[PDB]
């Protein structure tokens, strides 16, 4: 696949536009990987996926894995959460729901929005992706 130039430039109008695009998420995730922070978007995507789950048994099964992969010391590299949010998530993990990670997910979305997103816009990758093609005639 390959996104149109219109789609690309839309990512630069708002983070929302970027995050709502299947293509925009991947390029953004590639940029985050280059920045050693791709765990931020992967955690965020895992939380969105968890929200789709209706069965409480599977909510718990998937939630335990999200905690292990992104929040616990077991994680290869955990997302950055303050102690207030960590304590809330810990308590929510006793009987997981689809909203167990809401506080952490928001904190991480705000992080990507304010820290890594401006740098993605200023990146050579985005600046090059944003260049038109020649119109031959």
Binding site for Na ion (CB under 5 A): 54, 98
Q: Give whichever of 114 and 127 is closer to Cl ion, judged by the CB atom.
A: 114
**Nearest distance in Å: CB 72, Na ion:** 22
How far apart CA 21 and CA 11 sit, in angstroms, is: 8
Asked whether the beta carbons of 44 and 66 are under 8 A apart, the reply is no
DSSP 17-65: HHHT-HHHHHHHHHHHHHTT-THHHHHHHHHHHHTT---HHHHHHHHHH
Asked whether the beta carbons of 98 and 92 are under 8 A apart, the reply is no
Q: Give whichever of 41 and 136 is closer to Cl ion, judged by the CB atom.
A: 41
**Nearest distance in Å: CB 105, Na ion:** 15
Asked whether the beta carbons of 79 and 43 are under 8 A apart, the reply is yes
**Nearest distance in Å: CB 102, Cl ion:** 8
Q: 10, 109, 111, 121: which one contacts Cl ion (CB under 5 A)? A: 109
In a 3-state reduction of DSSP, which class is residue 3?
Answer: coil
Looking at residues 44 to 103 of the shown chain, list those that interact with Cl ion (rule: CB under 5 A).
Answer: 86
Q: Give whichever of 61 and 82 is closer to Na ion, judged by the CB atom.
A: 61
How far apart CA 91 and CA 129 sit, in angstroms, is: 44
Residue 15 interface partner, choices Cl ion, Na ion, none, CB cut-off 5-8 Å depending on type: Cl ion
Residue at shortest CB range from Na ion: 98
Point out which residues bind Cl ion (CB under 5 A): 14-15, 86, 105, 109
């Amino acid at each position: 696949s390959q996104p149109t130039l219109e789609e690309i430039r839309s990512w630069g109008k708002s983070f929302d536009k970027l995050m709502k695009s299947t293509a925009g998420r991947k390029v953004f995730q590639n940029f985050l990987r280059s920045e050693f922070s791709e765990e931020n978007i992967l955690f965020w995507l895992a939380c969105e996926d968890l929200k789709k789950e209706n069965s409480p048994e599977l909510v718990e099964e998937k939630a335990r894995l999200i905690y292990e992969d992104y929040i616990s010391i077991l994680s290869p590299r955990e997302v950055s959460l303050d102690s207030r949010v960590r304590e809330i998530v810990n308590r929510n993990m006793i009987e997981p729901t689809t909203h167990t990670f809401d506080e952490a997910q928001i904190q991480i979305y705000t992080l990507m929005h304010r820290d890594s997103y401006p740098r993605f816009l200023n990146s050579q990758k985005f600046k090059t992706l944003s260049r038109p093609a020649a119109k031959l005639n």
